[PDB]
Design a protein. Structure first.
Lengths: 153, 29, 69, 724, 105, 106, 106, 80, 32
């Protein structure tokens, strides 16, 4: 499996895809303004192929990638597209968990799940540095639970 | 009008069912 | 013999509600096998609130008196 | 004859009368001794059916077939099986059904021969052995009845003994029938191999090797491995063959059957050794030694107090038959899926690399039965937890510790089922949507580098990135590459064989989907057995049994709550997951049979490629079985494919709508029965009622199974035999 | 053979054109239809035993909501089941009636 | 719109405008109504906003503001005299008087 | 009694309308049975409802003196109106319209 | 037919015979409850087992159990 | 072989009388 800037069987797909798009492109007059945007669309098409060529991609023209952890391909898995999902999802999750900690008190529990004061939703921004602080508070959750669970009998 | 041995087999099957009831009646023998 | 209104822990031979925290609604001296009704916040599937419970059930939950500052 | 079920003035009595006919542990007047006895008799009444049906399989091949014309030209002559006779068949269809060799209408054989062997020509040969097999089956049944007779019954101290037949039955079956099998396959079927025909009167006089026994007796060397066989070979002519006890190639043999019966002969050598090493292990573990303790039935010891013996406490596993069934259908199921996976990479048949229709029918056969045995094992495991488990005895171990905290295990399994879904199917939806937009390159493709590493293990020396078997100089590669590795590297470096195929995206994402479905199925099969005695919705679930409707429609509802309901739920996942594996496996061969491999690893990445190129293109010769013009041979199959969608959708009647509506309708039917004149004179016996809530789902599961089975049993034959 | 088979040449052979959405909705309507096969076949009892395990994990971290997690109503499950059996059982022919008639228009 | 390459749905229909084909019968109804210019579309739409608002201020009128008694609903006799004559009658007459003077533009 | 009547009607219209589907699908895969079904294919189809269309062919002029055309060109036989593409056709029933109409009635 | 078994959780709020269709259960004076009533089912031969008392049964785990047993004409609720 | 002279000419009733007989036998059994 060779990279596509050297894989002659990938650039042929770019030519073939533009060829299929060209028959739809030439039937209409290019001077019309409602169809002048097709050239900008094919500009987006052209500007898309060059970045993927850098990633190792299938010889067939189907561009594959790496998740083993190889440092040359950490961009397709490990670092960007992966770690941000974990952080962003858990920035929401641990924020929800903090809201779960403040879900009791005197005002009805149902009122504090649904009809919440908007201020708690505005405080959500608190979790800039979840990791270890969240680990402490989750330890305390398991602790204060004191193995109080359902019967399952 | 075909399969005479099959007719005898069907007849002996009915007779075996009757003899099965007779065997239930005999029991001890 | 304990006073009414104590925080409970369910240890019924059948209902393994492992120390589901609840309070004693009232204490009855009528002496039966399953008398005590307690406010059970975990609404069971039946839908009610307080059910009958044994004398086993709860012993104590504060565990402290003078050392509990 | 169950009395509690007999006092049922309704038709329902018959259904359980057949449904609980094999449910021996719940018949009336059932005892501990009669259970094993009648179940033992059913064992002997079951193997008898197997051998009777095997005798019929051989009889019809002897009485009909061109196998003698096949052994000469086995590639051109299409194999046949049994004659077809039906006065319903139109002559126009029978003119197309009769093709190949015979003049009578004969169907196409699907069960391709495992026992290749010779063939015994055609002169009073196969039907005699088939009759002997059938009579042995009948005498097998009569021997079981002989055991049932009074005074000839084995006591309970014959099944429930650690010191019992667990020793001699093991090291005695695949061991005596190992030296016998080896001695009666590589020498009895050596005429089929080389052409050394031997009558059954002088086994000693005919040695295959140039020297026999005496070289093996020497401890220095066997003097049997220094003998190769030429590649050119015919059953009748050796073609330069130089006989040897062992004839391993390490590579894809010209004749597809094994490696000149290498693998074959090595099996029972290793299996006899398996018994030589096993038959000595557990033999002394037993010892036939009665326990010295008289604290088991004497007046001196009463009540519970202490167990019978710290080491002895295993009666809950040996007394129970559902646990033993849950393990016998489990280890055999491990080997069943292993056997299925060992029929495409290591084919023990000849001309499977050149045949098409027959190969696709055996793998999925054993695959579906593998899933069956798995479910049977787990269902009886649930029955073991309901009717045989006791927390008072098995306390303080790890088994009772499981269900004190099993909720944590169920949580992890549910998390896996959700994780492998949001990504497998999420990837699939992205694939379809971005391919529809005209951008297959924007698709987030995937490469299973782990599965690509399997191809690196094949010995390829041109890789160069520090992978296993990438250099012939590495001591790990140098180790044991002296004899069989030369055939290994030569056999895997080819695009024409099926020894470790190429793996990519359309190959990965289906394995991701198989992991998703199988892990979900695992959770569904396990939790039904865990929450079998009770749950939070219903802790008295132990106070009933296995097959019961509900606890009551109240407290939120108890719809489908029994352990039997978990089984009925599990079978649905079984059919679809085991169908996913087959839908995948059906492309890994049709993509190379046509030679256009670039179809799969380019179009199978998205689901629309699975829709247009398989469920539509391959089904052209299927549906064109009887076109409105000239119907041909694939008519009976194109009819089954329709009769399948009937039976399958027939199950949707029993599954979507429940039972009470049918009660209110059958009552109107019964009203019209007596109210109508003339027909009022006719009266029934058992009162007409609807199916039981349990029997409703069971019978509907029967339809949802057999209709789905026939849905895939008609597509394979016609679609593969239409284009080859 | 001549009806439900010959129609795939006008619903799937459209990714190269502008009728690609009627193929995605076609293949995606079978999803929600078979998604109705989840509610029209199973029962609330098993699924209610399924929540309490998730609620156990929710009681492990106290992340259990005040609104006690319970299964759908016995009648509401069938109402959603027919909703999906119809939505997934119309959008396929909606994508099919809008598939061939545009290609053969 | 050009966001994620979805512009492939712009079916080449003609008339200097690309988009998604419609099967609602809108063009046939509009041609049978004598509508030709785009201005006649916008005036009808802006006139529809008024009627749409008046009905919200009506369903919020006979309720939070007004409310007929229960006696106003047993007038089923008076209801069919206004549904078959005021709605069906005047409706079948009002549209009849339209396609007599708007037919010749079509 | 109501549902009893409708029940027997449903079963009679099911074991035949879809029964004939099972029957014909059997006749084809079986062989020469579908060949001998051709005469029955002439039955039912163009036997009923054919005269209704013929009534509508002769309805103008006779039973409709003030009408110079039928109710629709689906009634007028051999009268085809085309505007570069076929608008309506005298829907000649046949072969399996009796089949699907009874699948409908079922 | 069905087997009716009464738990010791009874409060005697008569929820059985109130819910119960054909009056399987019955209220009996008892000396070990708050209200002083206990449910008892003599006519278990006529019981159908519709399980509508477990709905009205108050206790955490219901107090009136009816284990599914055999089926006869009295327990099928059929008119023919 | 037998072709159309030995067992295939008596099969017509063999493949159908055992079903009729089996349904009859099992019905007599349940009638008992
Ligand atoms: C080695 C094969 C084997 C054997 C010997 C048995 C034997 C037995 N099974 Mg079992 N079973 C098996 C495989 C096997 N099973 C497999 C592979 C599955 C998964 C599909 C099951 C799933 C299963 C269930 C759910 C149940 C049994 C039950 C039983 C017992 C009564 C059978 C019955 O109800 O009537 C015979 C059943 C049939 C003839 C099949 C139904 C109708 C067919 C389609 C005709 C019986 C001792 C029942 C039981 O143990 O009671 C608690 C029970 O409910 N089995
Ligand atoms: C095509 C129909 C269909 C679909 C889409 C699903 C989908 C799902 N089932 Mg399900 N199931 C079905 C049919 C279906 N089922 C049938 C016919 C039965 C037998 C009656 C079952 C019985 C069943 C059981 C017993 C369980 C599931 C569970 C699940 C969920 C976890 C699986 C997963 O991949 O995570 C999610 C993947 C997604 C793509 C989420 C969908 C998000 C949408 C598209 C937005 C999932 C949402 C498990 C569950 O409850 O989850 C914890 C579970 O235990 N199913
Ligand atoms: C978690 C297990 C699981 C999963 C992941 C799936 C997944 C799928 N099932 Mg399935 N199913 C399951 C369990 C499951 N099923 C079970 C247990 C049963 C009962 C045995 C069924 C019975 C079933 C049937 C009957 C059908 C499916 C179908 C489908 C496919 C729908 C196509 C689609 O829209 O996808 C995504 C594709 C897109 C283009 C997304 C659309 C994007 C829109 C436009 C936005 C899909 C890939 C259908 C199918 O396709 O047939 C093969 C079908 O008819 N399933
Ligand atoms: C896993 C395979 C699978 C499954 C389970 C289904 C299932 C279904 N299909 Mg489908 N189909 C398939 C493959 C499949 N199809 C393939 C490969 C094609 C060719 C690409 C089609 C083309 C197709 C069309 C054109 C239509 C269906 C329709 C239907 C639905 C029939 C509705 C009904 O039962 O009412 C009753 C139907 C009858 C009595 C007949 C049904 C849910 C119909 C539908 O979904 O309507 C919304 C429909 O219009 N299918
Ligand atoms: C969220 C996406 C979306 C939206 C907002 C619309 C909106 C609209 N579409 Mg459309 N359509 C879509 C996706 C969408 N479509 C897709 C993916 C396809 C397949 C390519 C079509 C194919 C299509 C056709 C063929 C037609 C429309 C038409 C219409 C207009 C008629 C009004 C209507 O149908 O109300 C909504 C209808 C509902 C059933 C929704 C209400 C039910 C609940 C809220 C859900 C309307 C403005 C018609 C038109 O004339 O265009 C002006 C027309 O003929 N659409
Ligand atoms: C005998 C009653 C009757 C009949 C046969 C028709 C027939 C027709 N009407 Mg019409 N209409 C009617 C009553 C009727 N209308 C009434 C009472 C009103 C007032 C609300 C309208 C208002 C109306 C409008 C605004 C329009 C039509 C239009 C049409 C034509 C096409 C629409 C259509 O096919 O739906 C037909 C509807 C029915 C068959 C149901 C009527 C049955 C009644 C209850 C008896 C068509 C020939 C369209 C047109 O003019 O074509 C260009 C058009 O835009 N109608
Ligand atoms: C291909 C599957 C299938 C088949 C063959 C049938 C067949 C039948 N259904 Mg059924 N049904 C099905 C699926 C199916 N259904 C599904 C999925 C549902 C759930 C919605 C129903 C719900 C249903 C109801 C509620 C009723 C039927 C009834 C009937 C019977 C009508 C009487 C008749 O005409 O006999 C003809 C025999 C053949 C056509 C063969 C008939 C035997 C009705 C009935 O019992 O008779 C009045 C009835 O009331 N069905
Ligand atoms: C050697 C080798 C290896 C390794 C491996 C490992 C590391 C391991 C394993 C293994 C395994 C591990 C397997 C398995 C399987 C399993 C299964 C198949 C399961 C099961 C279970 C069961 C069957 C249960 C049942 C039950 C229930 C659930 C109920 C109750 C109780 C009972 C018990 C009855 C490899 C391959 C790498 C390579 C080659 C060589
Ligand atoms: C399209 C549309 C629109 C627009 C507009 C409109 C609304 C329209 C119209 C219109 C109109 C505006 C109509 C009308 C009306 C009218 C009428 C209704 C009339 C009348 C008349 C009469 C009634 C008469 C009577 C009489 C007399 C008095 C004299 C003598 C006798 C007689 C009887 C003839 C919208 C979007 C908004 C919505 C709806 C639809
Ligand atoms: C029709 C129907 C019935 C009625 C079913 C009846 C009356 C059974 C009818 C059987 C007749 C006598 C034919 C049986 C013969 C079969 C064609 C094959 C069986 C032969 C052997 C395999 C035993 C239910 O009881 C029911 C219950 C729950 C959900 C759905 C339904 C349901 O749809
Ligand atoms: C899954 C299932 C359930 C459980 C159904 C559930 C839990 C419905 C879940 C739907 C909700 C909408 C998903 C949870 C999403 C939350 C509302 C959070 C959303 C917050 C933002 C995304 C808006 C049943 O109750 C049932 C009953 C009878 C037969 C079959 C079944 C069945 O299959
Ligand atoms: S199986 Fe039937 S009776 Fe039992 S809970 Fe479900 S709907 Fe109710
Ligand atoms: S349902 Fe139970 S608690 Fe209620 S009155 Fe009856 S016996 Fe007493
Ligand atoms: S079992 Fe059914 S009929 Fe009997 S008391 Fe309980 S709810 Fe009533």
């Amino acid at each position: 499996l060779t990279p596509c800037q050297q894989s002659e069987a990938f650039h042929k797909r770019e030519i073939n895809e533009v060829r299929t798009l060209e028959n739809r492109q030439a039937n209409y007059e290019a001077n019309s303004p409602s169809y002048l945007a097709l050239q900008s669309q094919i500009d987006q098409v052209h500007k898309r192929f060059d970045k993927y060529g850098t990633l190792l991609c299938g010889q067939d023209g189907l561009p594959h990638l790496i998740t083993d952890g190889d440092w040359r391909h950490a961009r397709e898995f490990t670092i960007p597209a992966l770690l941000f999902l974990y952080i962003t999802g858990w920035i929401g999750w641990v924020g929800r968990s903090y809201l779960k900690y403040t879900k009791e008190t005197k005002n009805p529990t149902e009122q504090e799940i649904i009809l919440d004061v908007p201020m708690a939703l505005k405080y959500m921004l608190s979790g800039f540095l979840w990791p270890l602080s969240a680990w402490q508070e989750y330890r305390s959750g398991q602790l204060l639970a004191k193995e109080d669970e359902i019967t399952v009998s | 009008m075909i399969t005479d041995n099959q007719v005898f087999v069907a007849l002996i099957m009915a007779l075996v069912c009757g003899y099965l009831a007779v065997k239930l009646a005999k029991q001890l023998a | 013999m304990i006073k009414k209104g104590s925080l409970v822990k369910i240890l019924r031979p059948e209902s393994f509600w492992y120390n589901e925290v609840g309070t004693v609604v009232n204490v009855e001296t009528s002496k039966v096998l399953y008398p005590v009704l307690v406010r059970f916040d975990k609404v069971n599937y039946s839908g009610l609130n307080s059910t009958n419970f044994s004398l086993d059930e709860l012993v104590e939950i504060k565990v402290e008196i003078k050392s509990d500052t | 004859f169950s009395q509690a079920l007999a006092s049922d003035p309704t038709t329902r009595r018959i259904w359980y009368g057949i449904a609980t006919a094999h449910d021996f542990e719940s018949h009336d007047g059932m005892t501990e001794e009669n259970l094993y006895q009648k179940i033992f008799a059913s064992h002997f009444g079951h193997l008898a059916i197997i051998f009777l049906w095997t005798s019929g399989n051989l009889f019809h091949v002897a009485w009909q077939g061109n196998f003698e014309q096949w052994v000469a030209n086995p590639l051109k002559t299409k194999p046949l099986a049994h004659a077809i006779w039906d006065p319903h068949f139109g002559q126009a269809a029978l003119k197309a059904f009769t093709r190949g060799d015979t003049v009578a209408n004969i169907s196409y054989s699907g069960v391709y021969h495992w026992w290749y062997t010779i063939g015994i020509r055609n002169n009073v040969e196969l039907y005699t052995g088939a009759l002997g097999l059938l009579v042995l089956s009948a005498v097998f049944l009569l021997a079981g009845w002989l055991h049932i007779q009074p005074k000839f019954k084995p006591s309970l101290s014959w099944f429930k003994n650690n010191e019992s037949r667990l020793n001699h039955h093991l090291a005695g079956l695949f061991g005596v029938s190992s030296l016998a099998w080896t001695g009666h396959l590589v020498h009895v079927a050596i005429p089929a191999s080389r052409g050394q025909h031997v009558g059954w009167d002088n086994f000693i006089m005919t040695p295959p090797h140039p020297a026999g026994l005496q070289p093996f007796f020497t401890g220095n060397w066997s003097v049997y491995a220094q003998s190769p066989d030429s590649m050119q070979h015919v059953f009748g002519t050796s073609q330069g063959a130089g006989t040897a006890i062992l004839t391993f190639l390490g590579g894809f043999h010209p004749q597809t059957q094994s490696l000149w019966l290498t693998d074959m002969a090595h099996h029972h050598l290793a299996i006899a050794v398996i018994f030589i090493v096993a038959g000595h292990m557990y033999r002394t573990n037993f010892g036939i030694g009665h326990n010295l303790k008289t604290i088991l039935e004497a007046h001196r010891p009463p009540s519970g107090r202490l167990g019978k013996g710290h080491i002895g406490i295993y009666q809950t596993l040996t007394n129970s038959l559902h646990f033993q069934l849950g393990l016998a259908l489990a280890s055999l199921s491990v080997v069943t899926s292993l056997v299925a996976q060992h029929m495409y990479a290591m084919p023990p048949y000849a001309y499977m690399a050149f045949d098409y229709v027959t190969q696709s029918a055996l793998y999925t056969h054993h695959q579906y039965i593998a899933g069956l045995l798995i479910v049977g094992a787990f269902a009886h495991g649930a029955i073991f937890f309901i009717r045989d488990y006791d927390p008072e005895q098995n306390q303080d171990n790890v088994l009772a510790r499981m269900l004190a905290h099993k909720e944590a295990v169920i949580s992890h399994l549910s998390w896996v089922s959700l994780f492998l879904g949001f990504h497998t199917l999420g990837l699939y939806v992205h694939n379809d949507v971005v391919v529809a937009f005209g951008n297959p390159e924007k698709q987030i493709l995937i490469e299973p580098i782990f599965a690509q590493w399997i191809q690196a293990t094949s010995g390829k020396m041109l890789y160069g990135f520090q992978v296993l078997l990438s250099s012939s100089t590495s001591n790990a590669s140098v180790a044991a590459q002296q004899l069989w590795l030369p055939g290994w590297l030569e056999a895997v470096n080819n695009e024409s064989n099926s020894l470790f195929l190429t793996i990519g995206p359309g190959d990965f994402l289906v394995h991701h989907a198989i992991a998703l479905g199988l892990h979900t199925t695992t959770l569904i099969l396990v939790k039904g057995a865990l929450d079998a005695r009770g749950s939070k919705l219903m802790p008295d679930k132990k106070d009933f049994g296995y097959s019961f409707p509900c606890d009551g429609p109240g407290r939120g509802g108890t719809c489908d709550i029994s352990a039997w309901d978990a089984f009925y739920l599990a079978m649905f996942w079984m059919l679809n997951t085991i169908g996913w594996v087959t839908f995948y496996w059906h492309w890994k061969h049709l993509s190379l049979w046509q030679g256009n491999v670039a179809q799969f690893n380019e179009s199978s990445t998205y689901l629309m490629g699975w829709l247009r190129d398989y469920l539509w293109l391959n089904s052209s010769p299927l549906i064109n079985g009887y076109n409105p013009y000239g119907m041909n041979s694939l008519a009976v199959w194109s009819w089954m494919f329709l009769f399948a969608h009937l039976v399958w959708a027939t199950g949707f009647m029993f599954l979507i709508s429940w039972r009470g509506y049918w009660q209110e309708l059958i009552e109107t039917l019964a009203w019209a029965h007596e109210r109508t004149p003339l027909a009022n004179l006719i009266r029934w016996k058992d009162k007409p009622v609807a199916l039981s809530i349990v029997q409703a789902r069971l019978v509907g599961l029967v339809h949802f199974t057999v209709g789905y089975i026939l849905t895939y049993a008609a597509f394979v034959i016609a679609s593969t035999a239409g284009k080859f | 053979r001549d009806f439900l088979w010959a129609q795939a040449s006008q619903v799937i052979q459209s990714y190269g054109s502008s009728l690609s959405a009627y193929g995605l909705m076609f293949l995606g309507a079978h999803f929600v239809w078979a998604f109705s096969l989840m509610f029209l076949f199973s029962g609330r009892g098993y699924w209610q035993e399924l929540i309490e395990s998730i609620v156990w994990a929710h009681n492990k971290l106290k992340v259990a909501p005040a609104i006690a997690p319970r299964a759908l109503s016995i009648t509401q499950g069938r109402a959603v089941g027919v909703a999906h059996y119809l939505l997934g059982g119309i959008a396929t022919t909606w994508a099919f009636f809008l598939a061939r008639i545009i290609a053969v228009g | 719109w050009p966001i994620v390459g979805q512009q492939i749905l712009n079916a080449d229909v003609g008339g200097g405008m690309q988009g998604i084909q419609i099967t609602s019968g809108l063009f046939q109804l509009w041609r049978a109504s004598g509508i030709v210019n785009e201005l006649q579309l916008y005036v009808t739409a802006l006139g529809g906003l008024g009627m749409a608002g008046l009905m919200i201020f009506a369903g919020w009128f006979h309720y939070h503001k007004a409310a007929p008694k229960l006696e106003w609903f047993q007038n089923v006799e008076s209801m069919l005299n206004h549904h078959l004559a005021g709605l069906l009658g005047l409706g079948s007459l009002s549209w009849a008087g339209h396609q007599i003077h708007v037919s010749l533009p079509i | 009694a109501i549902i009893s009547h409708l029940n027997w009607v449903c079963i009679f219209l099911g074991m035949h309308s879809f029964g004939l589907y099972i029957h014909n699908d059997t006749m084809r895969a079986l062989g020469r049975a579908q060949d001998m079904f051709s005469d029955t294919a002439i039955q039912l189809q163009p036997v009923f409802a054919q005269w209704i269309q013929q009534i509508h062919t002769l309805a103008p002029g006779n039973t409709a003196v003030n009408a110079l055309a039928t109710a629709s060109y689906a009634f007028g036989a051999d009268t085809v109106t085309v505007g570069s593409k076929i608008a309506m056709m005298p829907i000649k029933l046949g072969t399996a319209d009796f089949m699907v109409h009874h699948i409908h009635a079922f | 037919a069905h087997t009716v078994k009464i738990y010791d959780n009874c409060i005697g709020c008569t929820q059985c015979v109130r819910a119960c269709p054909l009056d399987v259960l019955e209220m009996v004076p008892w000396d070990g409850c708050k209200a002083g009533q206990m449910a008892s089912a003599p006519r278990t031969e006529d019981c159908v087992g519709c399980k509508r008392c477990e709905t009205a049964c108050p206790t955490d785990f219901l107090s009136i159990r009816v284990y599914l047993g055999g089926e006869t004409t009295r327990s099928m609720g059929l008119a023919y | 072989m037998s072709a159309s002279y030995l067992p295939s000419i008596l099969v017509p009733t063999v493949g159908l009388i055992l079903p009729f007989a089996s349904m009859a036998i099992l019905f007599i059994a349940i009638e008992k």
